[PDB]
Write a protein that binds this ligand. Sequence first.
Ligand SMILES: *[C@@H]1O[C@H](CO)[C@@H](O[C@@H]2O[C@H](CO)[C@@H](O[C@@H]3O[C@H](CO[C@H]4O[C@H](CO)[C@@H](O)[C@H](O[C@H]5O[C@H](CO)[C@@H](O)[C@H](O)[C@@H]5O[C@H]5O[C@H](CO)[C@@H](O)[C@H](O)[C@@H]5O)[C@@H]4O)[C@@H](O)[C@H](O[C@H]4O[C@H](CO)[C@@H](O)[C@H](O)[C@@H]4O[C@H]4O[C@H](CO)[C@@H](O)[C@H](O)[C@@H]4O)[C@@H]3O)[C@H](O)[C@H]2NC(C)=O)[C@H](O)[C@H]1NC(C)=O
Ligand SMILES: Cc1cc(COc2n[nH]c3c2CCN(C(=O)c2ccc(S(N)(=O)=O)cc2)CC3)c(C(C)(C)C)cc1Cl
Ligand SMILES: Cc1cc(COc2n[nH]c3c2CCN(C(=O)c2ccc(S(N)(=O)=O)cc2)CC3)c(C(C)(C)C)cc1Cl
Ligand SMILES: [Ca+2]
Ligand SMILES: [Ca+2]
Ligand SMILES: [Cl-]
Ligand SMILES: [K+]
Ligand code: NA
Ligand SMILES: [Zn+2]
Length: 789
Amino acid sequence: TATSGSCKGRCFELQEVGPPDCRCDNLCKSYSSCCHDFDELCLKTARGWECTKDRCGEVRNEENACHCSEDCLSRGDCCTNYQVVCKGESHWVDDDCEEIKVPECPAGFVRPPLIIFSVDGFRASYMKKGSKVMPNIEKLRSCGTHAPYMRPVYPTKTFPNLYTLATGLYPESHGIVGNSMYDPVFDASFHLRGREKFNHRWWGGQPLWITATKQGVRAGTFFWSVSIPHERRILTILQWLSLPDNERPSVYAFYSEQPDFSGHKYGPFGPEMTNPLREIDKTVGQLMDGLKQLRLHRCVNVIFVGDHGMEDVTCDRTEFLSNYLTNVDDITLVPGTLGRIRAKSINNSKYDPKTIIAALTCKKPDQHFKPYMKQHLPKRLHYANNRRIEDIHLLVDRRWHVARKPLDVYFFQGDHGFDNKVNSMQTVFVGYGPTFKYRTKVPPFENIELYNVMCDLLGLKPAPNNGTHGSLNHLLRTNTFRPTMPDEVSRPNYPGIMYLQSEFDLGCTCNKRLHTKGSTKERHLLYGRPAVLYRTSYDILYHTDFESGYSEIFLMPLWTSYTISKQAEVSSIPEHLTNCVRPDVRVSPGFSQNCLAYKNDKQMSYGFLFPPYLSSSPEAKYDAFLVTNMVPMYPAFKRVWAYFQRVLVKKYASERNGVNVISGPIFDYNYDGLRDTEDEIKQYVEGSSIPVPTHYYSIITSCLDFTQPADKCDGPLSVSSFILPHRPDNDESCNSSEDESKWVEELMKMHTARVRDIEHLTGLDFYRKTSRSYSEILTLKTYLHTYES
Ligand SMILES: *[C@@H]1O[C@H](CO)[C@@H](O[C@@H]2O[C@H](CO)[C@@H](O[C@@H]3O[C@H](CO[C@H]4O[C@H](CO)[C@@H](O)[C@H](O[C@H]5O[C@H](CO)[C@@H](O)[C@H](O)[C@@H]5O[C@H]5O[C@H](CO)[C@@H](O)[C@H](O)[C@@H]5O)[C@@H]4O)[C@@H](O)[C@H](O[C@H]4O[C@H](CO)[C@@H](O)[C@H](O)[C@@H]4O[C@H]4O[C@H](CO)[C@@H](O)[C@H](O)[C@@H]4O)[C@@H]3O)[C@H](O)[C@H]2NC(C)=O)[C@H](O)[C@H]1NC(C)=O
Ligand SMILES: Cc1cc(COc2n[nH]c3c2CCN(C(=O)c2ccc(S(N)(=O)=O)cc2)CC3)c(C(C)(C)C)cc1Cl
Ligand SMILES: Cc1cc(COc2n[nH]c3c2CCN(C(=O)c2ccc(S(N)(=O)=O)cc2)CC3)c(C(C)(C)C)cc1Cl
Ligand SMILES: [Ca+2]
Ligand SMILES: [Ca+2]
Ligand SMILES: [Cl-]
Ligand SMILES: [K+]
Ligand code: NA
Ligand SMILES: [Zn+2]
C-alpha cells in the first residue's frame, strides 16, 4: 500500500480501502497496512482518559487523547467523564434505575442502536462473587434483564463461542470447531498465532455484521486489535455514535480479553482477579457515562455477555497419552481441555482407530478423560458434522488437561474448554435498554439463541441458524418474533382390525374396544399428537395404557406416549411373555417386525417402547407385547433401557407427581443431528428390513407446580429428556459390571437433551396442543436439564 498516505480526518474509518491506499480502519494493524501516521493520529494517549477540573473549558489541543473543551460534545470526542467533572453531572452508576419504556433517542435515530459488550472468560458466578467491586455491571444486571447464567457452546473456548454469538450456529456448522484446527480438504491449519486464521474460508455461516449490512443496517467493527487500549475502543464507539445519520452504525461490538487473561494465570478466583473485575467495571462505566453525555443512555440496547467461564487447572493435573499408547509417535493430538486425535501420517496403514480407542478405555481407575468416536459424543454437544472435527475425541474431566507426552507440558492456573454443561464453564448475560424488560430475571439459556434476538433488536431477518426463534421472547418488551407452528406434512392413518392372526408368521416362541378407538387417549397424550414434518406413511395406534405413531416404513413407532401417575404399580415381566410377541391385527404382516430375525441375529435382541412393567391391567399387558411395540436393542443396551423403564420411570412419577413419557427411536447414521431418510440407514437386523436405531429418546413432562398431577396441570410445564446412544457395549460406563443402580443414571445424565434436539433428530414437532403460549412452549423445548448443582 502507499503508506505515505495519511490518516488525517480518517481515524477508525468504518469502510476499509484497498491498495494503493493505506488504511486507517481498525483492521489495518492486523494486515500491516496502516498509513504511516496511524499511531500518531489514531492512538493518542496524551493526558490519559479523564477530564480534571483544571482542564474544564480548555482550548482544544488536538494532541490529547480525549477532550474537555466546550466543543467536545458536538465533536463526539469528550473524555467520558467530561460532564461529571466540568458540568456537575452525576456518573450513570450513581443515578437511580428508571424504567426505559420506549427508546429516548436524538432526532435522526431510526431504531435503538445495539452494543454487544463481550467479556472473555467472565464466569457466571462472578456476578455474585464480584458484586461489591462491579457497581456499573451490577446496575445493568439489576435494572435490566438478566439470566443466572448463559450456556456456551462446546468447546468452551473463545473463537468457537464468539463466532457462535455472531452467527447463531453450532461450531460444527460455522466451522470454528476449536481455537486450533486442521482442515483435511484444504490441507490447512488454523492457530491462534499466525496468518492462516485470517483466511475467510475458515469462517462459515453469516455473521451479524453481514446480516446487517446486506439488509441496509450499518455495523461497527467486531474485531479489536489487541494493541488498541480499552479506553480507545470505548471512545471509538462513542465517536461512531456521533456520526451523521447515513454513516452511523446501528450495531456495535466491544471485546475485552479480561478477565480471561488473568484467569488463566491465577485461576478463576485467585486474589489477583479482583483488580481485573474492577477494571472491566470501570470500562462499563466509561461507556455508560459516555452514552449519558451523548443523550443515548435511554436509547441504546446494551448486551453484556461472556463467551465461556474458567476452571482451576494446573500443569500437574495432566493425563499423558504416552502412558496409554505404545504407538504415541504415530498420532497427532490437539491437546488441553479437550483431545482430538488423528494419524500423524495418512500413509501409515498400521494406524487403527479401534486399537487406539481400546487402549484409552477405562485403563486407570481414576482416569480423567474418556475416549469417544465423535458420533458417540452426547448429542447435545452437536459436535461431529464437520471434517475439521477428528473422528477420535477425548472428553476431559473438569480441572484436567490431556497431552501427548510430558515434554509438551515444559505457568497457568486456570483454563476452559470442557463440556458446556460444566458449571465452571457457564457465563453471563444481561440485556439493558428500551427493548429489554425492566428488573427481570429469565431462566438460563444457550448462546446459540442470541443471534436471532440481536436480529430482532435491529429489525433484521436472521440467516438460517440453530436458535429457536421466539424462545427468547420473554427477554423482550417489544420486537418479539411470533412464529407459527410448522405445518404437519403427513397425516396419520387410523387403522382398525384388518388382519387375522394366521396371516402372520412371526416365528416367536409361544371396553377393550373403547380403549382401541382411543377412550383413555386424553390421559396418555397430554399435549396433542406430535406432528410429522416430512412425507411418510404412519398409523396412530391406541391402547389402554399408551398411544403410538407407528411407521410403516421403519417398522416401528416414531413415538410412543404414556402417562404414569404417582400411584402406578410396577409388575414383573416373565420371559415367556417377552418371547411371545403378538401380531397387531391393525397392521399388516408386511409392515411388521418378526421374532425370527432377532433369533437369527446373534448380536441383536429387542425391547419395548411402552414399558410392560407399568401395564395397568391384564387386558392392558397383552398390548405391551404387540409386535408394534417392539424395537431392536442390543443386549448391552437392554440393561440401560430396562433400568430406566423398571426403576426410573416410576421414581420420576413419584418425585414429580406423575409423568408423561414420549419415547422412540432415532436414526442419525451420518451424525448431522437431523433425521435420517430411509436410504441413510447403515444397519438392519440380520436378514430383515428392520432398521437399527442409533439412539433412543425419551421426553418426560410434568407440571411445574408439582402439587398438581401431570394429567391435571393448569399451568406451565416441566421437562427433562435424553437421547441415549444405542451401543452394543457399555464401554462408555467404566463401572458397568456393577448393578445398574451404580451406573445407568450417570450415563443418562451425560446424554441429557433438549426437546428441540429430538425434534431435529426425528422430524417431529411436540407440544402442539397445550394451554400455553407458543413462545413459552418454544422456551420449554430449548430447556436442558443439566444435573449440575
Ligand atoms: C444448524 O443450522 C444450520 C443452518 O440452517 C443447518 O445447516 C444447514 O443444513 C443443511 C442440511 O445439512 C445444509 O443444506 C445443504 O446445503 C448445501 C449448500 O451448502 C452451501 O451453501 C450454503 C448457503 O449459502 C452454505 O450455508 C453452506 O455452508 C456450509 O459449507 C461451507 C463450505 O462450503 C462452510 O464454510 C460452512 O461452514 C457450512 O458448512 C456446514 O455445512 C456443510 C453442509 O452444507 C457441512 O458439510 C459442514 O461440515 C458444516 O457443517 C455451503 O457453502 C446443499 O448443496 C445441500 O444439498 C444436497 O444434499 C441434500 C441432502 O439431504 C439433497 O436434498 C440435495 O439434493 C443435495 O444433494 C446433492 O449433494 C449431496 C451432498 O454432496 C449429494 O450426496 C447428492 O447425491 C446430491 O448430488 C443441502 O441443502 C446447509 O448447507 C447447512 N447450512 C450451514 C450454514 O451449515 C444445520 O442443519 C442446523 N443443525 C441442526 C442440528 O439443526
Ligand atoms: C462481540 C464479538 C467480538 C468479536 C471480536 O473478538 C475479538 N476482538 N479482538 C480479539 C478478539 C477475540 C480473539 N482474540 C484473543 O486474544 C483470544 C483471547 C482468548 C482466547 S481463549 N484462549 O480464552 O479461547 C482465544 C483468543 C484476539 C483479540 C467477534 C469475532 C468473531 C470477530 C472474533 C465476535 C463477536 Cl460476536
Ligand atoms: C471473518 C473473519 C476474519 C478474521 C480475519 O480478519 C478480518 N478480516 N476481515 C474482517 C476481519 C475481522 C472480522 N470483521 C469485523 O470485525 C468487521 C469489520 C468491518 C465491519 S464494517 N465494514 O461493517 O464496519 C464489520 C465487521 C469482518 C472483516 C477474523 C479474525 C478473528 C482472525 C481477526 C475473524 C473473522 Cl469472523
Ligand atoms: Ca485514494
Ligand atoms: Ca442424519
Ligand atoms: Cl481447540
Ligand atoms: K438375537
Ligand atoms: Na463398561
Ligand atoms: Zn481463555
